[PDB]
């Protein structure tokens, strides 16, 4: 109303944030940045409620301002930085990086990655053409633009950002047999392969992907993410690689383990 808002109550916060219901009255409103605030994960909540290296906002602010965090290269200092999906976040020394990837339950996981995993990253392009003075560029899902890309790169592909020079190391063509992380929707965190995508001339393209254990389910093209080839993923998958294991037998498994 009569200007952009600068607050967000702790009821309309995304459920994937996995925050305490009451915990006061307010919730951390993400600042403008790479990813949308609805599918974001601010450093405040990530380091206060999901990983547990701090207690409150003052402590986490002190931990970001001490040049300890190295989010996607630059150190960064904003507590409400919108860290989304497929983004590496370096944590000073001793090599803990924990690249943010959705779990099978729809929320975010804390799966730890290695130094090379943090050095490289994969981003899905969404819009490509030439700009001023006819320089082609690709806009990834993160938001970064890379000038002078490979001519073979097309819409709905995935490129490999080296994060050191700002260029594309490699690209994945969007075709059959491509691993999909399913970014968004009811199938959040699922892993599947591309077999057949509908033309959908009007719009809102969808593809009936297939999970490894013969689970066929269709997701919109706007909610896909090519993470690698078949049987050879280009990312470090967390435990439970989009299995979507059923409720009764996963309860049976947890009681068997316990």
């Amino acid at each position: 109303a009569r200007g952009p808002k600068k607050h967000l109550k702790r009821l309309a916060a995304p459920h994937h944030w996995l925050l305490d219901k009451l915990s006061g009255c307010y919730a951390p409103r993400p600042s403008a940045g790479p990813h949308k605030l609805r599918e974001s994960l601010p450093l405040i909540v990530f380091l206060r409620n999901r990983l547990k290296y701090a207690l409150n906002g003052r402590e986490v602010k002190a931990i970001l301002m001490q040049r300890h965090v190295k989010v996607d290269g630059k150190v960064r200092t904003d507590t409400t930085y919108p860290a989304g999906f497929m983004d590496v976040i370096t944590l000073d020394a001793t090599n803990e990086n924990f690249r943010l990837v959705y779990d099978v339950k729809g929320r975010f996981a804390v799966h730890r990655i290695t130094d090379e995993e943090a050095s490289y990253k994969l981003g899905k392009v969404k819009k490509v053409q030439l700009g001023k003075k006819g320089v082609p560029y690709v806009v990834t899902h993160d938001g970064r633009t890379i000038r002078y890309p490979d001519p073979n790169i097309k819409v709905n592909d995935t490129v490999k950002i080296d994060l050191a020079s700002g260029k594309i190391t490699d690209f994945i063509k969007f075709d059959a047999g491509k691993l999909v992380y399913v970014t968004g929707g009811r199938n959040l965190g699922r892993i599947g392969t591309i077999v057949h995508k509908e033309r959908h001339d009007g719009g809102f393209d969808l593809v009936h992907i297939k999970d490894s254990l013969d689970n066929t389910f269709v997701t919109r093209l706007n909610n896909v993410f090519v993470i690698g080839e078949q049987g050879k993923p280009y990312i470090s998958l967390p435990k439970g690689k989009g299995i979507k294991l059923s409720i009764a037998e996963e309860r049976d498994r947890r009681r068997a383990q316990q």
Partner: protein, 123 residues
Amino acid sequence: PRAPRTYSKTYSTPKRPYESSRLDAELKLAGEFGLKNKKEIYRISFQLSKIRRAARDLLTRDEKDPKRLFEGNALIRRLVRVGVLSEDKKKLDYVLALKVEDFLERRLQTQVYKLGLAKSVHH
């Protein structure tokens, strides 16, 4: 303003609170189990009716449907862990026949009496 808390009534007033046979039943139960004013009797009846209706709805569903199956196993496991459900007989049908007797049995005072630590319900 934070999110409001959730509260629900733990008892249910009967549709006919003014009659003889029901009153006799409750009064006998309270006298022979050593209870206060029968608010907890109404509460026990309320929870028993709730779980009995849930069991009836579960039995309505067809067999081998996981929807029915896993809720049935969960309810049976919880009820037998509480102890009002007999260990030998658990087939999602004896729950529809269980009464308030076992629920009042599982109270601390009755357990102490039947273990032999107070010699009286009131004690």
